[PDB]
């Protein structure tokens with residue numbers, strides 16, 4: 001666009017300076033030239049202004065790319081959807097002609113099952129809460145499992161902690177919590 | 187755009203015909219067949235209206251777009267869903283980092299080799315700088 | 316100092332997302348329907364084309380901005396017909412099904428508080444207010460019924476009270492604190508929402524950030540139109556008056572002066588719109604970031620999304636932007652306790668596990684930071700490393716071994 005503007009002839013008799021100078025006696029040529037200078041100077045100013053604005057767009061992108069490099073390649077980000085959909089594990093950069101390409105490796109949950117749950121287990125009047133897991137049931141037995149992957153464990157005193165009584169908890173269920181030392185102590 | 191279907195008489199007037207005329211908030215749409223079936227956004231028109239080519243006998247249709255499949259979570263006070271498996275997904279994210287670096291000799295652009303022109307460009311002070 | 320109580324605070328964050336999709340017909344603005352003026356305008360090359368493209372590009376971005384902020388959910392999730400979230404009432408932020416155009420109560424307020432052309436036209440957005448409301452309600456339904464799981468992959472249902480318990484763990488406060496205070500927490504939450512209604516309705520500047528965008532664009536156009544009457548060094552600002560009065564060779568001079576002035580005025584307008592568009596785009600990028608990190612998950616970034624420790628965020632639509640209701644945990648009613656980095660017992664240095672040692676003046680306990688729930692100091696909530704002669708602030712006490720009485 002910038003180059004083509006040179007042929008515009010911005011109100012002048014000709015877009016070509018040599019034709020203006022050849023055809024005219026000079027006093028008029030200066031006027032015809034001023035018209036071309038004004039238009040051509042305006043064209044450069046237009047070009048540069050747009051380049052400054054576009055440069056800002058790229059700068060912002062580069063700052064984002066640099067941020068991603070630091071947080072997704074040189075570490076493991078916990079920012080949701082910052083480094084791909086799913087739970088971020090790692091990423092690998094690849095170069096590109098005028099930019100960077102990130103390959104984001106994420107963990108995505110699949111094949112969920114529906115379990116019955118509860119906030120706590122009532123054992124001998126004590127409210128047992130899970131440690132780093134959730135209480136689930138298959139309709140019969142209750143188990144405790146890590147929230148993000150079904151891997152049911154027996155509910156024991158090593159998988160829970162005790163706070164208060166069982167009257168305060170809204171949806172507590174009755175069950176037995178196993179003490180691993182019971183068969184060794186008695 | 188912004189034109190009522192009452193206007194646009196039946197350069198060219200080939201596509202000013204009737205039958206296939208649909209009034210949208212975006213303007214008068216001619217040549218597309220409006221349907222009551224929603225679909226994903228294809229060619230956006232505006233105000234929820236999109237168009238697509240349906241091969242339905244290989245013709246352009248207009249519709250109100252769907253925002254995605256409907257779903258309902260089986261929520262209860264005692265039901266939890268837990269994944270038993272997982273997949274490792276790899277996605278690609280593309281970001282631009284830099285532009286082509288250019289510079290322009292303002293005198294060469296404006297005046298070139300014309301001395302009679304470069305002597306007038308001096309009257310514009312520092313603009314070139 | 317350790318908190319003994321807490322409050323649930325809900326605050327509003329207002330962000331612009333998009334501008335009115337304004338477009339200007341360069342040729343018409345400058346020349347109207349004058350043939351002579353149009354022919355002269357052609358002598359200025361591509362300037363007209365560039366201006367038309369610049370404004371077109373902005374309009375496209377305005378839809379892109381909206382799409383990135385709101386369309387972050389693959390499916391449109393609905394809430395159950397029976398709303399039971401453990402005492403938490405979301406009826407003021409969820410759509411009212413009896414009125415099939417809503418736009419929940421809070422959204423309804425936002426849309427009420429915010430408040431003949433020459434080549435100048437306005438295009439509608441691709442996403443209508445109803446569609447935005449549907450995306451927003453989908454996000455709320457997901458957030459409420461499946462926590463953040465729907466933002467990672469499949470939506471996995473979970474009881475709301477349990478969801479909150481997980482969000483408390485993210486604060487550093489043990490689950491039992493929520494379950495033993497569930498009624499209190501739900502009540503504080505519900506009251507906080509009621510306060511939002513009054514805050515938005517009462518304060519006229521609450522949505523100023525959105526109104527400012529509207530006002531700036533309105534001024535830009537009012538200015539652009541007024542420039543048509545400037546008469547930039549011509550006998551008349553009206554092209555028809557020039558053409559009806561002067562002969563060709565003289566009219567051209569007067570017209571060229573108006574073309575230069577009007578073209579310059581339009582270029583000025585467009586340049587500013589590109590700069591303003593960049594500001595709005597940056598805002599949209601921030602809003603989209605917050606949507607992902609505050610609504611589709613639990614952010615750990617300080618003061619990123621409300622003061623206090625982040626729990627939840629509930630999006631609400633607005634005319635040209637998004638409103639976030641940030642729910643945070645704020646510590647309250649702290650007490651002064653005596654502390655120590657370690658306890659000396661039988662020459663051993665005992666350090667706390669995920670807690671702090673405190674004293675009430677006579678007895679030492681292990682407490683939870685950000686809440687205060689003193690436990691007996693035992694081998695189950697402490698660990699041993701090194702001897703007692705290294706730690707500077709170490710105090711002498713007894714660590715209870717819970718197995719001792721089982722054996723003896």
Ligand SMILES: CC(=O)N[C@@H]1[C@@H](O)[C@H](O)[C@@H](CO)O[C@H]1O
Pocket residue numbers: 114260
């Ligand atoms: C993944 C799945 O099947 N979830 C089912 C749901 O489809 C059904 O509507 C609901 C009521 O029976 O029970 C859930 O466990």
Ligand SMILES: CC(=O)N[C@@H]1[C@@H](O)[C@H](O)[C@@H](CO)O[C@H]1O
Pocket residue numbers: 138139140141
């Ligand atoms: C309803 C059901 O599946 N119950 C089974 C039970 O029969 C089995 O003995 C136990 C083994 O841990 O696991 C439970 O989930």
Ligand SMILES: CC(=O)N[C@@H]1[C@@H](O)[C@H](O)[C@@H](CO)O[C@H]1O
Pocket residue numbers: 170171262263264
């Ligand atoms: C933990 C919990 O709230 N369980 C509720 C129970 O309180 C309620 O009485 C019943 C309907 O009558 O529905 C259950 O899901």
Ligand SMILES: CC(=O)N[C@@H]1[C@@H](O)[C@H](O)[C@@H](CO)O[C@H]1O
Pocket residue numbers: 122172173174
């Ligand atoms: C959910 C449940 O089983 N609750 C039982 C309650 O029915 C019983 O009456 C009480 C002993 O009197 O012990 C509770 O654990």
Ligand SMILES: CC(=O)N[C@@H]1[C@@H](O)[C@H](O)[C@@H](CO)O[C@H]1O
Pocket residue numbers: 190192
């Ligand atoms: C100027 C004009 O034609 N306005 C039309 C009106 O005549 C028509 O009855 C109405 C139907 O919705 O739509 C308006 O845009």
Ligand SMILES: CC(=O)N[C@@H]1[C@@H](O)[C@H](O)[C@@H](CO)O[C@H]1O
Pocket residue numbers: 222
């Ligand atoms: C909801 C609705 O109005 N559906 C009608 C459909 O019953 C009719 O067969 C069709 C004819 O083209 O037009 C649709 O708009």
Ligand SMILES: CC(=O)N[C@@H]1[C@@H](O)[C@H](O)[C@@H](CO)O[C@H]1O
Pocket residue numbers: 270271272
């Ligand atoms: C426990 C289980 O079902 N694992 C399945 C495996 O059997 C299957 O062959 C594979 C295919 O990708 O996907 C895994 O999640």
Ligand SMILES: CC(=O)N[C@@H]1[C@@H](O)[C@H](O)[C@@H](CO)O[C@H]1O
Pocket residue numbers: 320321
């Ligand atoms: C232990 C304690 O003081 N809890 C107070 C409660 O008594 C008070 O009613 C409520 C505000 O209504 O704020 C809680 O922090």
Ligand SMILES: CC(=O)N[C@@H]1[C@@H](O)[C@H](O)[C@@H](CO)O[C@H]1O
Pocket residue numbers: 404405406407505506508509
């Ligand atoms: C502040 C608040 O949430 N008030 C709601 C009220 O508008 C609603 O009608 C009622 C229905 O149970 O539940 C209350 O919690």
Ligand SMILES: CC(=O)N[C@@H]1[C@@H](O)[C@H](O)[C@@H](CO)O[C@H]1O
Pocket residue numbers: 316649650651
């Ligand atoms: C939470 C608390 O008790 N703060 C008190 C403070 O009010 C008092 O001015 C200062 C001097 O005695 O001692 C602090 O422990």
Ligand SMILES: CC(=O)N[C@@H]1[C@@H](O)[C@H](O)[C@@H](CO)O[C@H]1O
Pocket residue numbers: 707708709
């Ligand atoms: C943690 C600790 O060691 N605090 C002691 C403080 O009790 C004592 O009063 C002060 C000297 O006056 O020296 C500090 O190092």
Ligand SMILES: CC(=O)N[C@@H]1[C@@H](O)[C@H](O)[C@@H](CO)O[C@H]1O
Pocket residue numbers: 659710711
């Ligand atoms: C300031 C102080 O009381 N220091 C005593 C130290 O003299 C004693 O030897 C040790 C037990 O061996 O217990 C420390 O608390």
Ligand SMILES: *[C@@H]1O[C@H](CO)[C@@H](O)[C@H](O)[C@H]1NC(C)=O
Pocket residue numbers: 675676677678
């Ligand atoms: C410290 O807590 C214990 C708890 O049993 C209590 O008996 C004791 O009186 C308290 N001391 C002070 C100074 O409050």
